[model samples]
Target chain A: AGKKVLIVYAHQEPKSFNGSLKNVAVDELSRQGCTVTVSDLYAMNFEPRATDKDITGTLSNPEVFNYGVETHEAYKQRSLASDITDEQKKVREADLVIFQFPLYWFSVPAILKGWMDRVLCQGFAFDIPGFYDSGLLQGKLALLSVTTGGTAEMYTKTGVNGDSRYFLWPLQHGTLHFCGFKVLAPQISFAPEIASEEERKGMVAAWSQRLQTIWKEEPIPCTAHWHFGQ
Target chain B: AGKKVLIVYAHQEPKSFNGSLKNVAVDELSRQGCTVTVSDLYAMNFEPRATDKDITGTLSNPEVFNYGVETHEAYKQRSLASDITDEQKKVREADLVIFQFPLYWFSVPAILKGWMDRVLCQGFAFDIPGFYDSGLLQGKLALLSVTTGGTAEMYTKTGVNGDSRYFLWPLQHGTLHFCGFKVLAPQISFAPEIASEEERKGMVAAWSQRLQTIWKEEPIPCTAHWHFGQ
Candidate 1:
């Protein structure tokens, strides 16, 4: 019952629906006697670019700049930027990592995406021989709680936006699965902006309700079929 | 055939391999009497997050913030931020739009991803009723010229990272094709840092050579089958 939860929250406005959903996560999880930490990226003004400055010390190979190799080495030597290290520590300590954001162009916002690009270095997240089921962060759990502008009807196989799972492959399967976190099935709150006030409240309430029972749930198989279907 | 090509280049360092590839495209395309322009994202230090700042007027529905709705209204009202409008104009004018970036976490760097989020707004890139085959930017061509730290073998179907095309779905099918760009096969130059100097040169030379014959190539059918296989 002493679990730690890290919420990587991305949104510029505090009063927005994305913000409300994140608040709900903190409220419900904390009420359950869990320690919750939120990395409010926009408020943090988090730098989204992965540059040379990400590494503080000398490069392993200065002539050629390969981000994966350099960062992997930087992480091992503890020479990465302090901010990056700080977030990595939060990730390392957490039992569950939750990403809360309004879906931007069918994916996480740039700031949150930058967090993935920088924080999940090769050695810390996945090594050459130790990825997927054998990844560095294998024991931890990750979940994407996303809010979309489009309705559920638009995200179907025959819908204009195609299946929602089609867009989920790269993030759920490619990135998170590759990093070895047991990806809990995503919580998609559809079209909150267009929904009624009661409907928006229902979406936020539903997230809290789900979290109350989350620990007992098993992760879906992060496979191609689960995402694409037959 | 006179083509106006806009390369949305995303890399910080000027002398990096990404820069070299971008320079090669500029060179090859210019030599063929094509007008070539580049959006050096890192140079522009482009704002990657989509926020209320992107729209320059009274919010269409300020109380319940919706990026898609707000930006759509702003686009119709001629009040979107100038930088976003500037890029939109570039996309509108260009016969071909090429995205150049190093893949991070199986996706584009956050800055480039932000470019897609901010630049390709609803009214400009797609209409509510006009997406997929009927998207607004129907006649334009889009290609991803991407670089990766992993070798080609590593991104194979059975490799540690999974198939490269698996990472491309969100970009090709979801974003580019949804926005009505005729999707071109990606140019994924693998592991330049680990490759021999001759191999690196060959990768760059090969891209230039391909560009010379790219116009003669047909667009790929960017469907689930083309990416996942039968």
Candidate 2:
């Protein structure tokens, strides 16, 4: 009942279908007595480019800049930029993390992807040998609530998009599972723009209903077979 | 001999392996009597976030921000931002477009993803009924020349990270192929950071060698079975 939820929201308009979904999550979770914090990426003008500027004090190697090496060292020494550390703190304190965004090129938007690239660095998210199950953020839960431009029929196995599960493999298995978060089955609200107002409202209502018993849900296998089927 | 090539390079450090691969591509392609243009995303400080700012005059819907709808309208009206239009011009003129970047979370880095998201808008890359085989940019060729932190073995189906092809499906099939570009097999240089100087140079030389006969290469069958296998 006292869970701290963090929604890393990445939509420009508050009235967008993505925005509606985010608002419903905030309202439903707050009503259940959860403390909710939102990292509104667009409003914050979050930096999407990964540069040397992310490391604050000094370069690990002044002659050459290796982002992974530099960021890992900076993270260990707490020398990352304030913006990055701010997001890291939000991730650190959250019991359950939700990523709410429109799918850009079958993946998270660049701004949100930047959060994963910058905030979840080696020291903070996963050490080389300590990733996948033995990773740092083990007990935390993570979910992707994505809105797509393609229809449900268009994303099936024989359809043009080649099954929706095929697209979710990287985010659910590669990123979230690699970092030790129990990956929940994604809430895929497909082609909400093409839907009627009634349908859009139904999608939002479905999200609100799912959150009520979210804590009791078990994680998916997050495996190739589960994603692609045997 | 009169072919045009666009290399969309994304990496912070000019001396990084990604930079070296990009430079080698430009050098080899230019030497072969081809005009090579490199969109050095880091040097240009490319805007990675897609917002209303991407549209010059006015958004399609001033009340609510629907990026896809607004950008699609902007594309038809020639009202897109200069940065987006500039990249579109490169794509329009190129016989072959090469994306060279370090992988982040099993996909392109956020900056490059931003390029794909913003530049390849609805009207520019694909429309609802005009996507897949009948996409707008049908005659053009695209290749992802990527660098990865994971080793070749680690990306196998039974490995911790799963098959590398599992990761390529989104970028190759979903993005590039969706837009109707004939997708070339990717150049995956794995764990360059851990390699010796000679090994690193070998990887670069290998890419340069491949560029010599790139046009003669056939596009892969970008299918679910091809990516996951039977």
Candidate 3:
């Protein structure tokens, strides 16, 4: 009777510190009595490079390529055959979705972004005219859990680095909010690469607890209004 | 002899404002006496979605897939097949490489980013250790000409948005500098969508003139020590 959750986890290497975070996330989600699905993008060798085929399909026959509208036609066939189909299905089924990744150059890895380009296609994630008004995944809950090598202060508005909010805008608003998901404030662990054992343990504990709370709480408010019809 | 330039342009709609920027860039480069090669990604129907075939290529060739090298091989093949061949060759043959596009959200458009992910693959733009260290594209000049919907003041260090420099860091340092290209100070035109006709004309003129000047000047100093193989 638990809510279904899908965690789209992405990291290049499986043995990385991010891998550890992924495990911690899965464990915590299970502990929260949620039916969790983890799509380990790298292990699945998910492709992050799109080709002529994907675009041609979308441009020529948008109806077939948009949304979950799989007419199974020839042009639209490649999309359904994509590595993203399973993930899309999983996303469609889940009540809540979590995107967990290490902040690489202030964004998700190439493969994860590629997933969005493919799976969040026109009809599936938005309709041509109705997209801005009504997103495809309106009722879904979404959260971002990211690990970074820099200190949290560096990501602050007035810090030596810059406001981390700018980096989050694309992912949080452009993609997630655009799709109508109620996005929760991200759970961020900074200086993960240089964290001491105790710090690492603390981060892991904090993330686990955060995930549990988010699993039970109301979804974050949609920030899509800021970008609607832009 | 004039400088040879390559512009790898990405945009889904060629009539879009970003597309206009790309056109302007091509014209500027050409007018500057630089032989320009423009790769209009969307017109070529470049795919922004990567798939399993692009990942493993095993379904197409089990032996190569089993060896875990097929996907890499397939990706390489696809890159070679892309319209970028002439541009990639041009990059190798040219004096300047200009990436011109409107900033989508905070990052490059998915298709343009895909070009980097695919076209700038190993052995071409870079190698494992050698390319990452030695200056492969050393003498070549690199420039980022981006248009943003936001105003210039918004991208300030203490503005409502955030420091645009931070957003440029990864692209300027991580990608171009990582590849050993001599990057120029980026050319950015903010508030493009709302700018007055005169303002846009002024920007276009300024940018064109700047591109001509930088083509003759030395590359921007490599300020980020990390790019020096640290």
Candidate 4:
């Protein structure tokens, strides 16, 4: 049986550095005999907002309209919009999920963030008292393959950006860990736009090489210590 | 001169705790003789994705679309989409900007994040050489008035979520401060959904009172030490 991989890619241009990174993931993973799928968010024109339209018919609480509550109930009733349900189906079958995007404002792009807010609804990806180690999506691996505008040295502990991991806490600890996916250490290719053309190609080649042995890699200890050393 | 205030509000429900906070900001600021404007993002149905739609006429490079490069050039050429231009005008006019939203997955919702990503463009919000202390919007003030699903205790250093400050770094330091807005310390109203009716009223009342002295308040030193202490 082939291991299934899903790349939730969020980039507008196919020739951009973000696009190159995402393409490398699909190319190498497929070469490894893995069944790979990519959700090209920009091409799909993915809806990034979470609203009442997200529910197919009536809201769970039409009067109150709490998003978390409404979406959770909608998921349980199979009333979520077709787009959200479609992404959930991909996540359900994927043995490994890779998030590919350029870092925006030190976080994922709005399109990608919308994916987390909508598809990871309650009763689908998690539930109250059923998250973290006890989350719904155990036995899956997740990784953040990110590109940044700033240099790697600038994202260091004493650097101007104050440690690259500082920006990863919310995504790695709160979102991914809460969903119970063993998060592989992030692959951060920094300052790509500033790099020489040869250097940019080198970075893409490096990602291909990394993907070759990715299955054998152990997830980093997803704890405060690993994220923010004491 | 009376200050001009812009509230970039992003909650779907008009009667949500997030909404109440936005209302209070408008009421209090107007009462204090400031002219207030609101970009009710959801009601306005703001476009959150940064794509080719953001630019008009032609691409800077049709063969390869890089969002940052394309958007930045479009901003200079005045070829950006009308919606993006309108928001830029509002930001240009505002002496103080307040971001009011519910914290979704430890970050701003996609709509508000989109506002930051698109409106705060290079040459508009910041230039490559003009960020941090030398940022573009140097004379302006910004505040993140956020609501969270968890209680104040749950966001503590000893709490399950780890310090609330941990999740705030990307916004306060990376986005707001980098763009040259002196970030007033965040006003966090926690677990309003779980609060009693009276408690909910008090939360709004407290926000009103805080606004009375907001002009006298100082911006926090948005440094690594303030976010992650040794």
TM-score for the B chain of model 4: 0.97
lDDT of every model, 2 decimals: 0.88, 0.91, 0.64, 0.91
Q: Per-residue lDDT of B1-230 in model 2, one digit per residue for the tens? A: 79999999999888888889998998999999999999999899998899889898766678887788889999999999999999999999999999999899998888988998899999889997788889888999999998998888998988888899999999998999999898999999999978889999999999999999997999888788889888
**DockQ each:** 0.57, 0.85, 0.15, 0.82
lDDT of 1 at A98: 96
What's candidate 3's i-RMS value?
A: 7.8
Instruction: Write down the TM-score of every candidate.
Output: 0.93, 0.98, 0.63, 0.98
Worst 10 residues of 3 chain B by lDDT: B63-72
Clashes of each: 0, 0, 6, 0
* i-RMSD values for every candidate model: 2.2, 0.8, 7.8, 0.8
Per-candidate TM-score, chain A? 0.97, 0.98, 0.83, 0.98
Q: What lDDT tens digits, residue by residue, belong to model 4 across residues A1-230?
A: 38999999998888888888998899899989999999999899999999889987687677878888888878888889999999999999999999999999999999999888888888988788788888899889999999999999999999888999999999998899889899999999999989999999899999999999999999988877788788
Residue clash pairs of candidate 4: none
lDDT of 3: 0.64
Reference-based lDDT, residue A173, model 4: 87
Q: What is the lDDT of residue B82 in candidate 3?
A: 40
User: Model 2 — TM-score against the truth?
Assistant: 0.98
lDDT of 3 by residue, A145-193 (tens): 8887669897664453345654566677656876778888787889876
Q: Would candidate 3 be rated incorrect, acceptable, medium or high by CAPRI criteria? A: incorrect
